[model samples]
Target chain A: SLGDVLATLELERVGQWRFVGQQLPAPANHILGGHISAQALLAASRTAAGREPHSVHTYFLRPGDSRQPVDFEVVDLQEGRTFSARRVTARQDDKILMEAMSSFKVQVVYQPIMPEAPSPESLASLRWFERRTIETETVPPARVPMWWRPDGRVPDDPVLTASLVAYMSAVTLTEPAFAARGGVGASAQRDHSVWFHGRAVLSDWLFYDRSSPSSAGSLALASGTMFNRTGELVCTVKQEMYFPP
Target chain B: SSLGDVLATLELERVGQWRFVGQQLPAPANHILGGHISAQALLAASRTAAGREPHSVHTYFLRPGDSRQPVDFEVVDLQEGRTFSARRVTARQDDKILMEAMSSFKVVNQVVYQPIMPEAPSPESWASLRWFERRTIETETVPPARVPMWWRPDGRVPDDPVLTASLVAYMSAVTLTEPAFAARGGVGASAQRDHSVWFHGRAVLSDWLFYDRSSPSSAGSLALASGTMFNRTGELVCTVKQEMYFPP
Candidate 1:
């Protein structure tokens, strides 16, 4: 799986403005949204060699066919003295699968409190980062926090870790939002956005606390914060998804 | 003519490779209202792409806009695709960038799902626009501990979704900046740091809408506030986020 993920992010540099990346495997059948997002994040990082990513605002234009490999094209949106911006699009056979605009900054240290959780070593990474939810409803204490991380082989290289974090961010946002109406059935993501206020080794257990502040029109507005073993807030994520009432 | 007509002024002059657009909305502090430029910038960018609906716009305030001058917009069409298109707009005056933004659009094929509207009193129950809502809106509302609003466009409805979206975008920009001021413990002049908007589905500005807002974080002169907009029937409309620099 690690080899597969590596291949998925493997971009064959054609030129400064372009690249070609191959699709690997997905347990479901079609290409996964997280894979497209991470690869796009990786593509954006290539253009920005020095700075770390501060945030990414992304939208899924269409679904990807796992049968085809994707190509990424990056645009140097703006290169200011303190920050740089890049817009990357993943395409397959002339169709746009995903597009994102990400910004990279020098860095700043930050936080929100961490929730109660078990040690990271004891958990598995297979499903939901082997996450166990603390609370799921929209009661007074509405925020739902979880303990999970990329289940298998993890690493250093903050950029790569950020890509992995982007991958994991696509999946974990909805339950806390749906907890307002009791447990929900299936949910589909429309967009995934992340603001990285931190850095961490995926190997260390991370705490992710997701809360659904508002839910309407079958849409749930959820936000989450990811923390390192040291309890430092590493990344903040926000996502929008559709859940049938 | 309706109050919504102000958004039409956002219509820009296409002068090669970029769209030139601007508007002057007077504010209590006299700085150019950030939302005016934000909505106008999006309008300027959309004029370049045909038949595509905007999904989201993320922008940063490079400097405080001088409301006395009309800001110009220059759009760069970074990518135009079968399914998606991306554009970057830089808002300027006197050759200085007051704000910069990136927005994306798509030929949306409805994906079944959404959040229902949060429960709130009908917007009609609320009084006419107070200085808060009325400033951008010639309509206003008094200040409450938790800042919020339910507003209806006071004018004609446009046939174009982009125009209506721009109207909503214009309106959405108001209270987003206020959350930080509230957090700092008073009404004050706060410069916007960055602002973003995500359009979930279709919206027609003819109906009354509800906005529920809150500030989740504030410190070091930077504050973060976000809110969701829903149509009267409680259907999800759009979501907004803004980062502001609070005055000491």
Candidate 2:
């Protein structure tokens, strides 16, 4: 029954509502390689709903093989008064690659109440290119690279961009914290976790500000704040980075 | 410097002629591991006053704790407002302070606002991932995986909404790291280094509250994880962050 809708949409739906596909190319700086699996999972869930994804909870299972064709299985869990729940499993040759349970809510009109906006004019916007150079010299090292719009304008891919932001939010630190102690050189080991606060359209220049407070005993912490081009605080992120001593 | 000077910075007082001090620990867990005392020790020292219910505390671990020595606890009364009181505490051995914490408590109230419930099946709809053995397994090896959990409160949440909110605050601190482990490739099992939590409004734990967690990086035997607690209606109620160390 669900396959009928897929066929009508020109998607090659398999038995049990499984969609067969190849993994997307890996993103830059992928260490433990789960980004493609994560992105594919998001795309499949969004395709099934016929809308953009709202929020998802995913756990890294095993390292996914990018060379393999992955199968995505979507299960419609619950249809609620305001939100619907779906679980997507990414598999390759019968071994589950990654699994995520996501919630998508039909957009509704309700009161809009958010925290008082933080003043963007008071804070400096980070330029990614400049940040890369600064990373070579900053003490204690910044965690995430700062990239701002060249003209201080927002891009046109907010959802995809937010996902990228979420990904970058995890990688920008531990190396410097490790170097501070004069220990082993930086390693490629990385782990990421993210949460979607609300509908973030993908067409805006957003600012990402990140910092690490203390790095003692071979551990460090990075905290970040994200602002839309209009300077509204959209989300906050905090991450822990461990470096070998 | 005299012990009193070191204790004075923490602003501790002698409540019954026994001078005590308090300090705040950074948000890390490695500093907490292997300490002769557990978090319960710090919590007990902070709750000596009656009518004071624990809300949330954020601590920082500066160095390895020596179990062979006794840690002196110092408490600083930050503020005692109409609805809430805040305190900063420290754990010390000798003249050196090892960790510090900031804690707050609030008197109960009755007004509230929680968004409409989200559509999720009853808890029975999903299977529970057994964590006891997993916790032991990971603690012995890799860090534990943090899992999102939902439960109903044992009794009905209080009508005086503030108490309900405080209860939610208490619950948030109890297991903020479970979800972070789930986000990583593991189950919930890491030690706590430092922790911070903020209460949003009145909530009932017996219902469904989603605890989602993730770690951005882990290296040098230390790791950091953050989590957000959401009510079933998808309203974000509280945000939590923690840091810890994983001994190789």
Candidate 3:
């Protein structure tokens, strides 16, 4: 696991401010959306050394081809006293797969801590993470709450921590987008934005609450809040999906 | 300027590599409104692409603008997909970047169904204002906790999607930062820094638009708010997010 997935995010510096990332072992056909985006975030963080990440808002334009190595180009948009902004364009064979804008700040603004999570033994267990159910969607279209951490020994690097969070963002972000629709139809993610309230540890059992506010035109929306078991909010994520017309 | 003039002010003149546009929005606070730049950026991005309307855009306000100068927009054709076009728009004046935006345009097919929109009083129930029309919902003690407005450009009927989306984009920013004041129970040092809008379906600009919005949380001197726009039929047309800086 965790070692395998994290390796896929390994980056090699190629130019002044450009880097290339290894592709994930695609599941069946397409590459994981978060895998590519998290790697882009990694490449972006490498440039802005001192500040911590506040958010990485990336739009998935096309399905990533895992067979090809991805190139990440980072642009220093702004490096202010309080925050720094960078733009990362991820591509494969000249085709743009995704473009992400990441922001870094000097502090954590605030977060409404989540309630304590129930024991995983009392909930369903995944390979690397455990699923803890709170209240299912009163929205009917939205769902999920869980306790999770990397399976292998977690690293203390903050970028790696945020990268792991980025890797986990795609886990349940689009479920509600799928549920918002009446019939189970084919759907593709249009875009996703994450807001990091502060630094977080992936070694801990991070708790996440996911839901969807609304869905339409086969255009569905979902939000997932990631927090630790102690309820400290790490980041908040929002995404929109296109249910095939 | 009249509503016709308001729409006219945002019109862009295609000048070679970059698109040039003007703004008549006299920001009562001095600099240009974030909504104005974002709408203009949306227009520039939309103008650069073919066969698709903008679905969503995320913009960051790097610096304040001098309202006296004409807004210059430089659009980078990021990618042109089969059904989607990604664009990066930098709004500048005298080589200084005021606002930078990343927007996506897609051949938006119509999908009418949406979550039930909240009901609001008719626009007639409120007094008409200058360039924009809005009303406050003061049911909560803090006032405008759930600010609802019936917004429409004084009399501009947009025949196309860009203008319609522009109108929607303009009005969305009007009271987006109000929640920062509401949550704190009073106004503090507040200014909007970044904003985003997600367009869900075709908007009929000729119809009265309804906005239902709220401020979910405020932290680190920043308050976050999201809103939904509904049409005369009570159909949800767009979703919005506005972040403002507040005193810590």
Candidate 4:
């Protein structure tokens, strides 16, 4: 199943700067937003050449079907000396589903506040990853912790590692919002963003720390940080999810 | 000058479908602040959307904006749905582009479940610095990594949600990088690379608003900061995140 995710991210070159993505099997037959985001990032990376993506802003406009292969169109927004920007649109049969703007830089590097957490060895595994929650509500609400690693081996390419991080960044991101409320309900992600700080090593376990600072109206916001096992900050993720009131 | 003087910097002249030219304003540094550019860009898109309220905006400061020259904005519609609209606004002066922004607009409704507002002294007690009033509290070895203060326009602002949101956007840039500069012994060359803000709910500009900003990480010449803003009623209004180059 993990290998299936890797295959889903392996996009097909359809035409000039365009890509078509395969879908992972979903019981609901609805396409996962993370899968499409990773595919879009991959498509954007192909156009960037030597540069590595540092940040991405994504908006989910519509829901997609898993049975249908999604098409991604990458548009060159800016090609600067140090940074390159690309916009990707995901569509199915001419219907736009999602859009993303990603920025790539030639190369660069942060130390961040990494919260204390138990080692992956000490936590119980939940198949693909291990999940836990910090009880302290002083930082506003509870924070969800996850230990994640790719099931299959990935090449040591920077783009591959960054895109994989994007896929995992979307997992249960909205969970903390509900967990804070002491109830579970329906929620859909509206927008997701990621800022990469350092190179992510997929071969090792990555610790995900996430929390919900505010959940008002019908909208909820979650912020997260990922760190490598060695304590280096990997990336920061922010997403807004909608809970129908 | 009044707070309206600051808000006036966001006034724009329509050129066409999605094109606008903003008023030129004087800046002490001769370079317009990134938050002002971002706010004006969002206002341009909001004007295009007509009825929708902006829920989130992401912007990258590609080049420093010239304060003596008016900035031009070109908005492109990415998509428009039954309930949401997305637009890309690129701000430029002459042939050089200053910034690029992606703003999403939607109808926002409210319910009251949110993080408790962080404890802070009243805005009236803080030192007023022209357009902003600020106070800082330090924690032991961590020093003072966060800034809490109050911000409001010096003059009366129209009771429109969009205009108020833009005003908040412009003010959001205030002290965004201070935490990082402070963390590095209070000295560094700081340049904002990218910034993002989410409007959790509408806010009014005529009253003082409480804002708390904190630096979460700073390393390798880069630092990240996040802020939360609350209305006078203690209701959460917005949240912001910014990344910048702060070389020691």
Number of the top lDDT candidate: 4
- Clashes (N, CA, C under 3 Å) per candidate: 19, 69, 1, 1
**DockQ by candidate, in order:** 0.13, 0.02, 0.39, 0.43
Write candidate 4's Cα lDDT for A1-245 as tens digits. Answer: 56667677789998878999987667467666677888899999999989998888888878888888999999877787777788899999988888888888771233665677777767600123334444435344567677777666777888988987887787657677767655556777878899888789888888888888787667778888998888888888899887776
lDDT of each: 0.67, 0.43, 0.73, 0.77
TM-score of candidate 2 chain B vs. the reference:
0.51
> Per-residue lDDT tens digits of candidate 2, residues A2-86?
1221222232467655676544334342223234334544444554444433434343344456556567787654444444545
Rank by DockQ, highest first. 4, 3, 1, 2
Q: What is the TM-score of chain A alone in each candidate?
A: 0.84, 0.57, 0.89, 0.91
Instruction: Kindly list the per-residue Cα lDDT of model 4 for residues B1-248, writing each as its tens digit.
Output: 44556666667889999999987567676777787788899999999996999989998887777788889999988778777788889899998877888888876544346667777667666111245444444332142367666776666777888988887877787567776666666645678878899888778666778788777765466667788888888888898988786544
What local lDDT does model 3 show for residue A240?
A: 77
Deviating ranges (above 4 Å) for candidate 2: A1-17, A24-34, A47-52, A107-145, A148-191, A198-204, A212-223, A238-245, B1-170, B173-248
Model 2 scores a TM of 0.38
* Model 1 per-residue lDDT at A234: 74
What is the full ranking by TM-score, best candidate first?
A: 4, 3, 1, 2
Residue A212 of model 3: what lDDT? Answer: 71
| Model 3 per-residue lDDT tens digits across residues B1-248 | 25766666768887866565656356555677777778888888888887678888888777778876778888887778777788988888877777788898877543334567776667777111256755664444242257767776666675887878876887787568775576676647666767788887667777677888777555566667778898878877888887766645
TM-scores for every predicted model: 0.71, 0.38, 0.89, 0.90
lDDT of 2: 0.43
State which candidate, 1 or 2, has the greater DockQ: 1
Worst 10 residues of 3 chain A by lDDT: A124-133
Model 2 C-alpha lDDT per residue in residues B87-132, reported as the tens digit of each score: 5455667766555554545453311222233344445560011110
Fnat of every candidate, listed in order: 0.03, 0.00, 0.29, 0.46
